[PDB]
Write a protein that binds this DNA or RNA. Structure first.
Lengths: 48, 279, 28, 445, 431, 385
RNA sequence: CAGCGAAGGAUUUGGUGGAUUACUAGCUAAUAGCAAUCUA
């Protein structure tokens, strides 16, 4: 049943966001005097 | 070109083992050569890039030894459908040829190493390598009974090897290309034939002198000799069969083929012969 | 414009090397 | 300080002024012979001023976990087989020998199917012949070849039953009121289905059929059904051995395509669902292991000219199960349209909503979707259009992102009029209008 | 080579020496405050005295400029000429200039630093001698007129080649020009050495960390479609991530967290690299915002991990280190958040490491896998090692109630794992 | 069999065969003496021109060759030949039947290691003559002291001592008193190469698992260790122009460059030579120079150069990767076909089993060039397959 | 459009290396020294 285990392993894979060329181009506008943790969650919103 | 990658008869020519690709994986099947005495189940190589590089019928549970390209000799019974035992060397080098005498299996490696295994003990007995033999792709045990002295190894250039000293005792001028058949005919002669040439030559294993040259009229794929040296049937690249009848007699230095067999259909389509057997 | 990955024309220079002929002494 | 003293240099005594190189390591003009340890120290300082002392020797001798693992590794990605699922955005796909290159086709290759077990590829087209090829890498040869006179073929399928997996039928059909069924026996015994058992008015052409498995559900006896797409909304389901009309399922609109989903129930029992799409975009699902009754009716979000539905990720009609316990529920469902838009639904959650939203709508190729097939693992979908040249894309999923490195501008895809995936080898066959099946191998499998 | 080439080389060597009046005027009119016609008539005493005033203002703002008043801004330096002392005195005053520049990189929004580094521009010629450190220090300020001014008077280095159409221009360089500047590999090595000196002398400020992280993740984004450029780029940005994680600033630590999370979601890194990355993350974790970013970073870095071996028990050293930085309440609370992060493979590895390495905290793994939902292979591996736990040690109520949860959901799967190894009646006789 | 029409002249098209070559330095220029079967060939390292070919073929294959200033020492079957300008000046017969397989030359001493783990020391007669000529003593490395001798070197300022690198150990002999001064501790894997560093009394050892040890031969310790996993190390070289780089050479054909000062890895040249023919067999920095000469068993000899750094202030941290410079080469497989290109007997076309068509010069070996296989454009304008 | 068509194709350009005469090694105060140095 190893083929069934391999199919459930490739079946339990969830859709993710991939990095593009221009997934992070619109961050320079608001890296001005914001805090670095706000930058981290602004990046994590793009990644998710 | 032919789909059958490897193929060999059992001794007495009653079954044929053949490795063909099946949708990117090798498969090894056995067919009876006469139905009056299909076989629809194969051994499947489960990896897409593992493939059989040589195969040899053992002689009595009947089995094949399949020399793979990952440093393994698989031993596969044909009535059942599993590899019964997996010989392995210490390496990942593909193995270029195997042979056996009795229960004593010998094999050559792509790193020009010699390995010896025992089919009765399932153990790697010896591992060595000898100088000035560096592109080996054939070995053949010269038979002397249960003594397995004198290997006969080819690299485009046949060399006779004493295994007690692990050294070369004769050197034969081989060919200009890698040797593809290297087979012992009598207790004093061996035939050899290379890749992409239509010339066999029979050497005297005691002196080094070439007795005769046998000339096919197309590039030789396989050969078979009858068990008493009286006839040699080679099968060529254009799908023909050529029989040299009594080649070891006095057409004096080089002999042509005596008989030539080809197969056509009822149409005019010429089907090719691969891998015949003579007795 | 990107940075300019151009190769210079290479000439060898005069280097000093320790030779080991002074690393052997004889006894009286 | 030192791990050895040799007791010979102390009693050696060298000259200095005999050669010009040692003539420089004097400290006076009266020194002519010096001791050995002195002489060793003089030329040690001389060696140090020829090659100056670097900082790596006396600087150091041998939270740093990342720095250490970077200084030891040389490759930085997953190696070969510890991946088990495809990397997105870059394929790994070699080209093999063109499968029908041994024996050419005299028409556009209209349908194409691999065998479920054997290494066989069946091609067929409007030149009313069907050819089987033993495929491998190097030499794709022709097994056999059967020319049905006066019957151009449009769909041809390897059927292999679930009970004994020993039948190996080929069902083939075109724009005719019959459908042939060749029983594979290696003369050739073929039969002809030409009776709709009272239902000939609603089935005037046997072109669009699909073959599937059905369970009796009072015995555990399966049998194959062929499913014919008819005129009004009709799907006529009939037995694949006796040809008896079993049931019929009518959708409301212009029936354009349909697919077969299976779902397991218990040990040795499964259920067959027919999924049929209107031209407008509304989808019916019929349970047909009972009487052919609707269990779900939903609507495709967007989509106005709908040409092709497909499921994938489990056992489709093109990745068939050889054994009844290996039947899987399909995860993905792609509805491909006339504008080239392919909605993609994820049926692990989109069986409940009844207006389900797609997980992505692909838009990469711009003319009419005529093939879309799922790879047997259900990680690639293959969009293909027979309208312009080279219109084929392989979209990776779950990520729903098209592979950007294949096909290139120099792939000889042609005008892609059929496509097929191998059930085991990871291997595409792509048939174009010139009569050529081109063959590729995906090196992930 | 040619004579005009060799003479261009000797001009570039003798760039700063004033050999007549016209070269002295063209070379002394390069100011950072005044225009050329005023700057050519000013003296050294005038610009020194108001630069010393501005250094007193800058020093009462930040008291680390007083030693620059001792050496670089003293009154012996009015008469100190740059190109009259040897290479050793030159390297002494050039690391003095580097110290001043990476100290005053943060202060570039307030006019005392402009009037103070005016004297480094006009006495020590740092716009043409120490120019790489000047560009690298004020790179953050590229939308501002002070970077416009240093670009107008700068002589541009060969690594900074793409700014050559924005020199003596009225419009600032754009962000896409900044990403094209950072996209080089030699520029990346240069900037990481600059950051290494920043991290060493403890001058990393948050506007710099924001700009640096933005340009780094844009470099990774630009190179996200060629694996050979990503593979050239990995031991540069992971090395600078290690050197940012090896410092004390919470801001630079979460800058490294951002770089690591973007880089691991851009390409599938090795398992051992990801584990050593989480070890370097946890080995200096002291803040709270750093803890928030560190938990999110370790979750995403374990999420982006494929193949046979994604959800093993993480080993004993790294699991007890992760325990000492994050106890049970922290992990359970963070999973109870309504924003729903994706913590699947990491939480599976965590519970399997608890079952191999703790063997007391099993009620908490019942509560947390009651909280978040997992996949079939995740819960299959969880119940297989719980089966092995039952067969190694005596089976008490916490393991029993865990199997009651694994019976209350997906009992067919626990039957499938018992039939793959064991039996259901034998397991009920066990517990 | 000797002939009476044709007499042997030369064997052209050969550059190396994977014996580790020797470099030598006349004045401020460098020459590179590479073995081609039974002759060696001296090349001018500034332009890779063939200066000299050894005058007679040796009775067996040359197996270890070194080069001091004007003289080249080539060890074949039993004996060591001392050659100047190709023409052999002296022949040192060893008193054994064992095959000499390593040698070093320092001072008045030539030291030649055979394969029965004996070492033969030869001495000059008077320190003004040119080469060591008379027999002096014999040294022996027995099985208690160390394994098979894997290298034989003399690291500098060591008054008449010899570092013998065995497969597990490092011994240090005094070659005047015949004594074993110092035997180090063992090494947990078999060491394959050795190279003396330009740092004082430091040797660098390369193992059969992937690590470079930096042994300090006076303290008896190891200074540092560099790990290159799953790579057998076949060469070691040091940069000596004020940039502390090390270059290791890996038998899968790779040349890896390390900074020793800041402990980073500068660059990797992958597939610099064929693994099937031995990988990179000898790589050495011409000293004081940023150029490194590699040679492999695939009949090829290359040079790589380091351009000066692209950052005008940093430099030491922005190291531009090594680029390719001149190289000589021939066929890596035996040739399959032969033709003469013209009636003047100047060029000859030559095709081999390694699928290359070379055009070899019978007049000047620099003119030998590989015929290129870069296809033209299609005549109509369609695509080529 | 047809046709050609292997994980892309075309055009243009900067730099370097090798050939463009037929391969006997660098320096110097040269029958030899040096090349770590010519000088006491």
């Amino acid at each position: 049943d190893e083929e069934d285990i391999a199919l459930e392993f490739i079946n339990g894979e969830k859709k993710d966001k991939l990095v593009n060329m221009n997934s992070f181009t619109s961050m320079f506008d608001n890296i001005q005097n914001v805090q670095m943790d706000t930058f981290f969650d602004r990046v994590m919103k793009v990644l998710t | 070109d032919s789909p059958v990658l490897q193929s060999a008869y059992d001794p007495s020519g009653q079954y044929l083992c053949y490795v063909t690709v099946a949708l990117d994986k090798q498969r090894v099947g056995v067919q009876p050569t006469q139905r009056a005495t299909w076989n629809e189940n194969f051994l499947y190589l489960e990896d897409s890039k593992l493939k059989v590089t040589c195969l040899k019928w053992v002689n009595d549970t009947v089995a094949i030894i399949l020399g793979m390209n990952n440093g393994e000799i698989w031993l596969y019974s044909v009535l059942a459908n599993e590899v019964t035992y997996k010989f392995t060397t210490g390496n990942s080098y593909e193995i270029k040829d195997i042979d056996l005498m009795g229960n004593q299996l010998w094999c050559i490696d792509s790193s020009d190493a010699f390995y010896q295994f025992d089919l009765l003990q399932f153990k790697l007995l010896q591992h060595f390598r000898i100088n000035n033999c560096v592109q080996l792709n054939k070995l053949t045990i010269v038979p002397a009974g249960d003594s397995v002295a004198q290997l006969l190894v080819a690299s485009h250039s046949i060399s006779l090897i004493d295994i007690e000293e692990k050294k070369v005792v004769m050197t034969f001028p081989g060919h200009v290309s890698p040797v593809s058949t290297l087979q012992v005919i009598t207790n004093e002669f061996f035939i050899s034939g290379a890749e992409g040439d239509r010339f066999l030559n029979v050497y005297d294993i005691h002196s080094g002198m070439t007795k005769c040259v046998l000339v096919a009229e197309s590039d030789i794929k396989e050969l078979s000799h009858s068990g008493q040296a009286d006839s040699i049937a080679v099968t060529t690249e254009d799908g023909s069969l050529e029989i040299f009848v009594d080649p070891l007699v006095s057409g004096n230095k080089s002999k042509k083929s005596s008989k030539k067999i080809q197969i056509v259909s009822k149409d005019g389509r010429k089907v090719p012969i691969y891998n015949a057997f003579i007795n | 414009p990107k940075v300019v990955r151009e190769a210079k024309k290479v000439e060898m220079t005069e280097a000093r090397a320790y030779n080991a002929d002074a690393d052997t002494a004889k006894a009286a | 300080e030192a791990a050895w003293i040799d007791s010979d240099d102390e009693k050696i005594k060298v000259p200095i002024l005999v050669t010009n190189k040692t003539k420089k390591l004097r400290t006076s003009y009266n020194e002519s012979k010096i001791n050995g340890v002195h002489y060793i120290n003089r030329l040690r300082s001389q060696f140090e001023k020829i090659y100056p002392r670097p900082k790596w020797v006396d600087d150091e001798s041998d939270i740093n976990a990342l720095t250490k693992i970077l200084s030891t590794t040389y490759n930085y990605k997953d190696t070969l087989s510890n991946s088990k699922l495809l990397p997105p955005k870059k394929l790994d796909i070699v080209r093999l020998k063109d499968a029908n290159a041994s024996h050419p086709s005299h028409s556009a290759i209209q349908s194409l199917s691999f065998h479920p077990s054997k290494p066989l590829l069946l091609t067929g087209g409007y030149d009313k012949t069907l050819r089987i090829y033993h495929i491998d890498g190097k030499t794709n040869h022709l097994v056999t070849s059967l020319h049905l006179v006066g019957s151009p073929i449009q769909t041809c399928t390897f059927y292999t039953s679930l009970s004994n997996q020993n039948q190996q039928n080929i069902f083939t059909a075109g724009r005719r009121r019959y459908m042939h069924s060749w029983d594979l026996s290696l003369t050739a015994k073929i039969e002809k289905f030409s009776r709709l058992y009272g239902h000939e008015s609603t089935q005037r052409s046997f072109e669009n059929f699909k073959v599937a498995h059905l369970q009796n559900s009072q015995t555990n006896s399966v049998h194959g059904i062929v499913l014919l797409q008819g005129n009004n909304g009709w799907i006529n389901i009939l037995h694949s051995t006796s040809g008896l009309w079993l049931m019929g399922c009518k959708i409301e609109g212009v029936i354009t395509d349909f697919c077969i989903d299976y779902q397991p129930i218990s040990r040795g029992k499964f259920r067959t669902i027919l999924i049929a799409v209107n031209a407008y975009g509304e989808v019916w699902e019929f349970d047909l292991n009972k009487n052919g009754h609707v269990i779900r009716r939903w609507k495709d979000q967007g989509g106005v000219g709908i040409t092709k539905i497909q499921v994938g990720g489990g056992t489709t009609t093109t990745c068939p199960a050889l054994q009844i316990s290996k039947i899987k529920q399909n995860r993905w469902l792609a509805v491909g349209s006339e504008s080239g838009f392919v909605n993609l639904y994820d049926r692990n959650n989109a069986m409940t909503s009844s207006t389900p939203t797609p997980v992505a709508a692909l838009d990469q190729l711009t003319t009419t979707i005529s093939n879309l097939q799922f790879s047997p693992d259900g990680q690639i979908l293959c969009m293909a259009s027979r309208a312009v040249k080279d219109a084929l894309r392989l979209v990776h999923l779950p990520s729903c992102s098209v592979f950007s490195n294949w096909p290139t501008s120099g792939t000889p895809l042609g005008k892609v009029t059929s496509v097929a995936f191998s059930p085991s080898g990871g291997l595409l066959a792509v048939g174009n209008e010139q009569g050529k099946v081109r063959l590729w191998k995906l090196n992930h499998y | 080579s040619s004579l005009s080439d060799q003479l261009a080389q000797v001009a570039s060597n003798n760039a700063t020496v004033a050999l007549d009046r016209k070269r002295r005027q063209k070379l002394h009119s390069a100011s950072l405050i005044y225009n050329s016609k005023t700057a050519a008539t000013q003296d050294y005493d005038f610009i020194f005295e108001n630069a010393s005033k501005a250094l007193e203002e800058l020093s009462q703002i930040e008291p680390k400029f007083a030693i620059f008043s001792r050496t670089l801004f003293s009154e012996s330096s009015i008469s100190l000429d740059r190109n009259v002392q040897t290479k050793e005195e030159i390297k002494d005053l050039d690391n003095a200039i580097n110290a001043y520049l990476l100290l005053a990189s943060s202060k570039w929004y307030l006019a005392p630093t402009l009037h103070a580094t005016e004297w480094l521009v006009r006495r020590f010629q740092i716009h043409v001698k120490n120019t790489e450190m000047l560009l690298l220090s004020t790179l953050n300020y590229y939308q501002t007129p002070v970077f416009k001014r240093i670009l107008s008077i700068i002589k541009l280095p060969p690594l900074f080649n793409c700014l050559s159409n924005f020199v003596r221009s009225e419009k600032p360089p754009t962000a896409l020009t900044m990403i094209k500047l950072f996209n080089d590999m030699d520029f990346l090595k240069l900037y990481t050495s600059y950051l290494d000196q920043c991290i060493k002398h403890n001058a990393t400020y948050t506007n710099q960390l924001l700009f640096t992280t933005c340009c780094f993740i844009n470099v990774v984004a630009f190179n996200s479609n060629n694996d050979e450029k990503l593979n050239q780029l990995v031991p540069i940005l992971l090395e600078i991530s290690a050197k940012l994680l090896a410092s004390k600033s919470k801001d630079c630590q979460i800058a490294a967290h951002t770089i690591l999370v973007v880089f691991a979601t851009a390409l599938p890194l090795k398992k051992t690299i990801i584990l050593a990355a989480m070890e370097t993350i946890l080995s200096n974790l002291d803040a709270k915002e750093a803890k928030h970013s560190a938990l999110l970073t370790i979750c995403k870095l374990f999420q982006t991990l494929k193949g046979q071996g994604n959800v093993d028990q993480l080993p004993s050293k790294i699991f007890k280190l992760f325990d000492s930085k994050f106890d049970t309440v922290s992990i359970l609370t963070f999973l109870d958040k309504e924003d729903k992060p994706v913590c699947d493979k990491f939480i599976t590895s965590y519970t399997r490491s608890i079952a191999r390495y703790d063997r007391s905290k099993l009620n908490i793994i019942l509560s947390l896998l009651k909280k978040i939902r997992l996949e079939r292979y995740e819960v299959r591996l969880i119940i297989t090692d719980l089966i092995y736990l039952s067969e190694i040690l005596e089976d008490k109520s916490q393991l029993v109630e865990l199997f009651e949860y694994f019976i209350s959901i997906n009992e067919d799967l626990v039957l499938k794992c018992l039939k793959s190894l064991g039996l259901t009646g034998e397991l009920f006789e066990i517990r | 069999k000797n002939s009476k029409i044709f007499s042997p002249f030369r064997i052209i098209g050969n550059v190396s065969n994977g014996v580790p070559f020797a470099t030598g330095t006349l004045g401020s220029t460098f020459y590179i003496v590479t073995c081609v079967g039974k002759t060696f060939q001296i090349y001018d390292a500034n332009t890779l021109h063939l200066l000299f070919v050894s005058e007679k073929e040796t009775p067996s294959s040359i197996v270890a060759l070194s080069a001091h200033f004007h003289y080249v020492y080539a060890a074949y079957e039993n004996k060591v030949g001392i050659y100047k300008r190709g023409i052999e000046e002296h022949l040192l017969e060893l008193e054994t039947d064992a095959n000499v397989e390593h040698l070093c030359i320092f001072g008045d001493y030539l030291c030649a290691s055979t394969d029965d783990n004996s070492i033969f020391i030869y001495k000059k007669s008077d320190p003004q003559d040119k080469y060591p000529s008379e027999f002096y003593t014999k040294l022996t490395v027995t099985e208690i002291q160390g394994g098979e001798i894997v290298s034989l070197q003399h690291l500098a300022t060591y008054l008449n001592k010899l570092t013998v690198v065995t497969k597990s150990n490092v011994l240090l002999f005094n070659v005047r008193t015949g004594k074993l001064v110092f035997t180090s501790n063992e090494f947990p894997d078999q060491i394959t190469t050795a190279e003396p560093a330009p740092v004082l009394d430091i040797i660098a050892l390369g193992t059969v698992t992937g690590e470079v040890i930096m042994f300090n031969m006076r303290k008896g310790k190891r200074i540092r260790t560099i790990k290159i996993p799953q790579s057998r190390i076949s060469s070691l070289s040091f940069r000596t122009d004020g940039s502390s780089h090390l270059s290791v050479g890996t038998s899968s054909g790779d040349l890896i460059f390390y900074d020793l000062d800041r402990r980073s890895r500068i660059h990797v040249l992958k597939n610099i030579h064929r693994e099937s023919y031995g990988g990179v067999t000898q790589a050495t920095f011409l000293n004081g120079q940023p150029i490194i000469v590699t040679s492999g068993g695939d009949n090829s000899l290359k040079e790589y150069v380091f351009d000066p750094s692209l950052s005008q202030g940093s430099g030491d941290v922005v190291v531009q990767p090594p680029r390719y410079l001149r190289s000589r080469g021939g066929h890596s497989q035996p040739p399959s076909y032969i033709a003469f290109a013209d009636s003047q007997s100047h060029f000859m076309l030559s095709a081999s089993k390694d699928r290359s068509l070379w055009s070899f010069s019978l007049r000047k070996d620099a003119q030998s060039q590989e015929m290129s296989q870069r296809l033209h454009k299609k005549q109509d304008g369609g695509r080529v397959g």
